[PDB]
Amino acid sequence: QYNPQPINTSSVALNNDLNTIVQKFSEHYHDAWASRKIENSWVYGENWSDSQKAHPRLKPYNMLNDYEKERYKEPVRESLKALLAIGWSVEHSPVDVVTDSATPFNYNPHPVDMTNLTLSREMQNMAERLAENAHDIWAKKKKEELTVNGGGIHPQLVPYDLLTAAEKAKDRERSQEFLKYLQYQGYKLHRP
Ligand SMILES: [Cl-]
Ligand SMILES: [Cl-]
Ligand code: NA
Ligand code: NA
């Protein structure tokens, strides 16, 4: 069938420097996410609504609660722990009027633009490995939730390689961006 088994991160703990890069990437990615939502006509609203494209998280990062910030930090932190677990080394060495009307918070996100930077084929491969691991993490938790509630199904409870590209996009894009951001910030990743 499908038995999701995320990478075993036993013993791996992030030091202050890697916690800092998780923090900085999460602020960066939030701004990237918000820039993309705003460009696609979303606006801030108190309750999330797919129908009318209103999103409570469309605020400056410093206005987010810890739950909202951890939506960025948790996957990123786990992908970094997974990299280390499998033996990788991480060496630290005008305002548009319509866009500003997206929120009442005078918020015009201007993240650093990573589309300028390229990833090696090897790092693209790694981003797919990290994206698969994020899927397996979600899938293991989802199966647990269904089981404790007496059973059930979910259409995405399938191996990563059976997902469509659109189903993979959220995790693939986060991991590609994270690896570019590591590059941008002067980190070198060394294969086992
Ligand atoms: Cl913070
Ligand atoms: Cl879910
Ligand atoms: Na172990
Ligand atoms: Na990739």
Author numbering: 2838 to 2930, 2952 to 3050
Sentences from the paper on this structure:
To gain more insights into the molecular mechanism of this phosphorylation regulation, we have solved the crystal structure of this domain at 1.85 Å resolution. DBM Repeat34 domain (residues 2836–3050) was recombinantly expressed in E. coli and purified to homogeneity using a five-step purification protocol. There is only one molecule in the asymmetric unit (ASU). DBM Repeat34 is a horseshoe-shaped domain consisting of five α-helices, two β-strands, and three 310-helices. It has a clearly intrinsic twofold symmetry as previously reported for RyR1 Repeat34, but the symmetry is partially broken by the extra helix α0′ that is only present in the second half of the domain, the difference between helices α1 and α1′, and the difference between loops α1-α2 and α1′-α2′. The two halves of DBM Repeat34 is connected by a long flexible loop previously defined as “phosphorylation loop,” where the classic phosphorylation sites are located. Second, DBM Repeat34 has an extra helix α0′ that is not observed for all three mammalian Repeat34 domains. This peculiar helix α0′ is right in the middle of the phosphorylation loop and behind the flexible portion. The surface of the domain is mainly negatively charged with a small positively charged pocket located in the inner side of the horseshoe formed by helices α1 and α2. Third, there is one glycerol molecule trapped in a positively charged pocket formed by residues from helix α1, helix α2, helix α2’, and loop α1-α2, including Trp2870, Lys2874, His2892, Arg2894, Arg2908, and Lys3028.
